[PDB]
Amino acid sequence: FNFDEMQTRRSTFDNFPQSLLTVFQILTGEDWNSVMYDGIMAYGGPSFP
Amino acid sequence: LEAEKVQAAHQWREDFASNEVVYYNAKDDEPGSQRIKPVFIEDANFGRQISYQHAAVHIPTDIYEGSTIVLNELNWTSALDEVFKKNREEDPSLLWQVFGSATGLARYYPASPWVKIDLYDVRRRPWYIQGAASPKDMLILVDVSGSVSGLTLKLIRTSVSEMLETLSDDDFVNVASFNSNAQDVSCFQHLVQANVRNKKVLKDAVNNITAKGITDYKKGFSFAFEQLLNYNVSRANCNKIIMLFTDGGEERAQEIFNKYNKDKKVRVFTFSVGQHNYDRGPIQWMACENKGYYYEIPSIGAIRINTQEYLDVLGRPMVLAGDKAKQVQWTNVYLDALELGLVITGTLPVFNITGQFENKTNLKNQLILGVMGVDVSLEDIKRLTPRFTLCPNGYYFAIDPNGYVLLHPNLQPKPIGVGIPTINSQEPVTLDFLDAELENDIKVEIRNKMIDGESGEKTFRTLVKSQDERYIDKGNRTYTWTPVNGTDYSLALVLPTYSFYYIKAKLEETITQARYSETLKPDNFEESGYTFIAPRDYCNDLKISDNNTEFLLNFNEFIDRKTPNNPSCNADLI
Amino acid sequence: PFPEDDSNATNSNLERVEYLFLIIFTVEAFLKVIAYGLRNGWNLLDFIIVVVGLFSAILEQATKDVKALRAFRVLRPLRLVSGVPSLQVVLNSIIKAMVPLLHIALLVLFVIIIYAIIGLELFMGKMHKTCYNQEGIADVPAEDDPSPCALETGHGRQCQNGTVCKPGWDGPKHGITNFDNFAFAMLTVFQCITMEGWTDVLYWVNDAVGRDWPWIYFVT
Amino acid sequence: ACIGVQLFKGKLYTCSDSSKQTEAECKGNYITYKDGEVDHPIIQPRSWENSKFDFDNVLAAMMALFTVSTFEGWPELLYRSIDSHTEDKGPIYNYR
Amino acid sequence: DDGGFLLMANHDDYTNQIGRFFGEIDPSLMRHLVNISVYAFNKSYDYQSVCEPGAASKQSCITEQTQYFFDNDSKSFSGVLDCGNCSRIFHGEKLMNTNLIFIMVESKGTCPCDTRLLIQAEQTSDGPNPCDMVKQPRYRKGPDVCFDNNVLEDYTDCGGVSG
Amino acid sequence: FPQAVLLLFRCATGEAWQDIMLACMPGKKCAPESETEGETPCGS
Amino acid sequence: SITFFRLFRVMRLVKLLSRGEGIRTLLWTF
Ligand SMILES: *[C@@H]1O[C@H](CO)[C@@H](O[C@@H]2O[C@H](CO)[C@@H](O[C@@H]3O[C@H](CO)[C@@H](O[C@@H]4O[C@H](CO)[C@@H](O)[C@H](O)[C@H]4NC(C)=O)[C@H](O)[C@H]3NC(C)=O)[C@H](O)[C@H]2NC(C)=O)[C@H](O)[C@H]1NC(C)=O
Ligand SMILES: *[C@@H]1O[C@H](CO)[C@@H](O[C@@H]2O[C@H](CO)[C@@H](O[C@@H]3O[C@H](CO)[C@@H](O)[C@H](O)[C@H]3NC(C)=O)[C@H](O)[C@H]2NC(C)=O)[C@H](O)[C@H]1NC(C)=O
Ligand SMILES: *[C@@H]1O[C@H](CO)[C@@H](O[C@@H]2O[C@H](CO)[C@@H](O)[C@H](O)[C@H]2NC(C)=O)[C@H](O)[C@H]1NC(C)=O
Ligand SMILES: *[C@@H]1O[C@H](CO)[C@@H](O[C@@H]2O[C@H](CO)[C@@H](O)[C@H](O)[C@H]2NC(C)=O)[C@H](O)[C@H]1NC(C)=O
C-alpha cells in the first residue's frame, strides 16, 4: 500500500494492530470500498488477474 | 566587530507591545512591528532604485515576522545601519553590504525593494555557507533497502539533491548506497571535487536508484569508513562527515564505530525521512556517539531547513578558535541575486559572545550569529586593469587556486552549462582557465605555476582562436604573471610581440586639436566618409548607449563645449 | 510484512521457528494417521494445512511465488476451534442458520445480475470524458479529483471555463468504478447495493449523462 | 462522552503544515508543493484549526460519539485521535 | 581561405551560397583534405552557450566548436580522391602573401558517391565525460586553514536528547 | 423539492450526513438569485 | 435513438425467479 501519492494511507495492513483496525473498519462497512480500491491498485490494477 | 559588541548588550525582551520595532521590510508595497516608506531615488552603480537612509530586511516566506526570534533580530541588528552608512562615507564606490542572520533574515544596505515564487533563503547562499564552516569531505550513505520504497524513497532523492546544493568546489563529496550490500550509485567510485559538473552526475545517478533488498548497516558503514581513508586521491584534508539517509532500524552497528572511528575523527549525521513507525532509537545513537546530529524529514516542506542545518554542528570548532578563525574569504564568480551581474563576495563570521566578561555560559555561545558580506563587482576589477594601452590581442586575466578565472575576456554574464538541455542561476559561474581559451601543454605548466603563487614569464608560440569562433591563427605570446600579495589570486598579462610599444599622443595646443574635431561632424560624413566612434569611458560626464549615433553626437558636442583642461576627463584617451 | 523483500531479525527467527511448528504438526498427523487410515471434516483441514505447509517449506528451500502459498498459515487459528467442543457447538449453531438465507442470497444474486445488465445497457463507457485545461493531454488539469463531463451536444456537465471536454480518461476511481463490461458493472452494482458510496456513482453518472433520468436506476 | 472528554480534551488541534507543533508557531505563510512535485510550490496561509468533531466539552463529545455510532466518518476521527499528543499541541504520527 | 570557407566557385550555384563551409557542399573532398594534412582542426567546448531544446525557450548548453587552419607551409598539393570504384585527381595551390588556397577537382557527378557531410558549426554536446576525467584531475590547491576536532567542543546535544 | 427529497434519502441511507450538517452551518454565502450586510449572513 | 425498449429484453430473466417453490412463496408472502 505504498504508492507515490503524497498522502500516505492510514487504513493499511502493515502491522497486526493496523490490520485489525482495517478489518474492523471494513466490518462496520464504512469506506470499505476505498480499502478495496487500494488493494486493487496494490496489485496490477483494473486487469483480469 | 560592531555586530558582536551590540548583540552582547541585548536584553531579550519577550513581548513587543509598548516598544515597537521599526524597519523597512523588503518585498512589500500586523502588530508588533512598524514599517518604513523610503525615498527610493534612482542611482547609478545599481540597475535599480535605492535608498541610502536605512537598510532593507529580507525575511523568507516560510518564516513568520513577529515571532520572538525574528523580532529580537530586528532590534539588535538595527544598530548596523549606522555602520552601513559610515562605511559608504569612506568608500562611495561600495556595493551591497549584507548581514545574513542564522535566524534566516538578511539586512542589506542600501535599501532596495526585493526582486512568482520567492524561495530565497540566506543560509543557503554560497557566500554564507563558505563562511559558516570549513571545506568538508562529505560521503552520503543512502539506504535503498525495501522498506524505503514508495513515498519515503522520493523524499530521500529530493533530500540528497538539496544536500548536494550546500556543497561548493572546495568541498569533496561522493554518494553511496547499501541494501544487504554496499555500492556506489554512480561511476565515480571515490571522492570527487563537487564542482558544477560532478554534482550533475551524482544528482542524475541518485534519481535512478530503486528500493529493493534487506537493510545492512554493517556493510554500508564499512564501505563509508573505507572511502574516507583513501588518501590515494586529492581530497580536502578537512571535515569528514557521513550523511546517513534512512528511516529506521534495529541495529546500532556498535562494533564498526568502535573499530573505525574509535577516536571519533569522523562525524555521523543521521536523517530519518518519511512517515513511519520504525524505531528511531539506534539512529539517534549514532549521531550522539559520533559527534554528529539527528534530523527528521517527514515531508517535502521540511527538506530545505533540515539539509542546511548541519553547518551549525561543523561551525563549533570555528568559534572555539576565537579571533584566529576570522579571515576574509572571497567566493567564486557568481551572479548577484539583486540583478547586478558577476560579483565576488567577502565573508566574515560573527560570533555570539554574551557573558564573555565572566566566561560562564558557553552553551549557545558556540554558534555563529551569522555571516557578513560585501559584494565586489567584476566591473570594478576591470577598472583597475586598463587595456587601451595595448593591442586588441593583449589582455589581463586573473586565476584562483581552484583554477577558475576571476578575470578574463571570455568570461560572460550567464550561467555555465552542464549536459544537454532537454524538456519533457543559483550556481556559480566557474570557468576553468583551460576552458576559457585553447588548451596547450605549456598552458598547463603556466596554470600550475600561477595556482601555487610565483612570479615568472614565458614566451612561446600557440594557436589562438579568433573573436568569432571560425578561424585559428598561430602567433607569438608572452605571459607575465605575479601573485596578488594579500589574497590568493594570480594576475597575468597576455602581451604578444609587436606591442611592447604604444603611441602616446602629445599636444598642448588647441590649434591642431580644434581642427580634428570637425572631422567627426555627422553632416561632414559625405566628404570624409562615414565615421564611427568607439564607446570608451572618456569620462563619467559622457554616457554610453551602444547606438553610436547619439554618442558620436554627444562626443563632438562635448569636446568643443568642455574646456581643454578636462579636470575629470583623462586626456590620454581623448 | 515489509515491502520489496525487506526484513529484520524477528522475521528470520519466526521463519526459523516455523520449521519447528511444521515438524510438530507433521508428527501429530503421522501419529493420528497410524491410529486409523481423516474422514472427519475438521481433520481433513489439518491434513491439508500440514501438507501445504510442507510443500511451501520445500519450495522455499529449493527455489531459493512461494510466499503467496504460505497464506494457508492463516487457517491454523481455525483449528483452535476444533480443540474445544464448546466453541464447536456454537459454530455449528451459527452455520446452521445459513440454510434459510440461501433463498435471500439467490434473490440478491439475481437482482445484482439484472441491474448489472441494465446498467451495462444504459451507461456504456460514458464515463471517459473530462475537462483538460492544458492544450493537450498531460496531467488532466481538473482540480484534484476530476469528474466526468459531457460534450456540448450532450446533456451532462460542461465546464464553462477555459478548459474543454476531451475523451481519453481512465475513469473516476482509476477506472475501477464504471459499467464498461459485465465484471465492472457487477462490482459497481454490488458496491452500490451495500449502500457505501452509491451517491458517488450517482453523481458521476449525473455528470456524464443528464441529471433527470438516471436517479430512477440508483433509487430503485 | 465524559470519558472521551477526559481523554482528548483539546488534544485534537492541528496546524496546516505538520512542521509547526503549537499555535504560536502556526502563523504566517508556508510553502506546499502541488501533487508532491518539488518544482511546483505554492504559498498557503498557516491555520490553527480544531477537528470537524472534537471532544472539547461534553456536548461536542456527544455529537462526535453520535456521528461515530452512526458509522459515519469514524475512521477519520479514530486516526486523528490516535495522533493526539498533548493537551495543547499538534499531532504525532501513530503516537498512541 | 584559411578556414575552409567558400569565396568563389564555378557551377554558379555554389556562388549563390557564398561564405559557407566547403565541407557542407563537398564532404568527400573536405574529409580527404584534412587527411592529407592541409587543414588541421582543434575541437573545443564552450560552456556558455544557448541551444534550442528537444524532446525527452533556449537554456544554457555545452557546445563543441571546431576551427580549421593550414597544417603545413607547403604550397604544392596533388593527389587522387579514391571515393570507391572511381578516380578523382585534384591539384591545390595556395595564393602567395594571402591566406587563400585554390583547388582544381573533377565534377561531383562523375562518381555517384556521397559520404556523410562534414559540419563546422556550434554542434551541441555534453562532453567531456567526467567518469574518466576525475581519474586525472587538473592540479589544484585548497585552503591551508582547517578547523575541526577541538577539545572544548560540547556536542552534548543531538536531535535525540530533546526527544 | 426532488433534490431535497434526494438529499434526505441520502441522509437516511447515511452517506455523508455528518458532512452536510457542517456544510449547513452558519457562515455561508448564498446564491446571487436571492437578494449591504450580505457578506455571508445566510445559513442557520 | 431510444433504449427504453431494449431493457425489456432483460426483464424476461425474472421469470426464472418463478421456478423455486420456497423463494416464490417467500417473495409473494412478503
Ligand atoms: C547568544 O547566547 C546567549 C546565551 O549564551 C543567548 O541568550 C539566551 O537566549 C535565550 C533565548 O533563546 C533565552 O532563553 C530564555 O529561557 C527560556 C528558553 O526558551 C525561555 O522560557 C520559555 O522557553 C520556551 C521553550 O521551551 C518557550 O517556548 C517560551 O516562549 C519561553 N518563555 C516563557 C515560557 O515565558 C525564556 O523566555 C527565555 N528568555 C528570558 C528568560 O528572558 C536566555 O535567557 C538568554 N540568556 C541570556 C544570558 O541572555 C542569545 O539568545 C544568543 N544569541 C542569539 C542571537 O540567539
Ligand atoms: C532594542 O529594543 C529596546 C526597546 O525599545 C531599545 O531600548 C531603548 O533604546 C533607546 C536608545 O538608547 C533608549 O532611549 C534612551 O535610553 C537612554 C539610556 O540611558 C536614556 O537617555 C533614555 O532611557 C532614553 N532617552 C530618551 C527616551 O530620550 C530607551 O530608553 C531604550 N528602552 C526603551 C525604549 O524601553 C534598544 O535600543 C533596542 N536595541 C537596539 C540595538 O536598538
Ligand atoms: C591505494 O589503494 C590501495 C588499495 O586501496 C592501497 O593498497 C595497496 O594496493 C596496491 C595494489 O593492490 C599495492 O601497492 C599493495 O597491495 C597495497 N599496499 C600498499 C602499501 O601499496 C595502496 O596502499 C594505496 N596507495 C597506493 C600508493 O597505491
Ligand atoms: C591543435 O592542432 C595541432 C596541430 O594539428 C594538434 O597538435 C598536434 O598533435 C599531434 C598528435 O599526434 C602531434 O603529432 C603534432 O606534433 C601536434 N602539432 C603541434 C603541437 O603543432 C592538436 O590537434 C592541437 N594541439 C594541441 C591540443 O596542443
Ligand SMILES: *[C@@H]1O[C@H](CO)[C@@H](O[C@@H]2O[C@H](CO)[C@@H](O)[C@H](O)[C@H]2NC(C)=O)[C@H](O)[C@H]1NC(C)=O
Ligand atoms: C608580495 O610580497 C612579497 C614579499 O612581501 C614581495 O616580494 C618582494 O620582491 C622584490 C623583488 O623580487 C624584493 O626586492 C622585495 O624585497 C620583496 N619583498 C620583501 C618584503 O622582501 C612581492 O613583490 C609582492 N608582490 C607584489 C606584486 O608586489
Ligand SMILES: [Ca+2]
Ligand atoms: Ca458510509
Ligand SMILES: [Ca+2]
Ligand atoms: Ca529497512
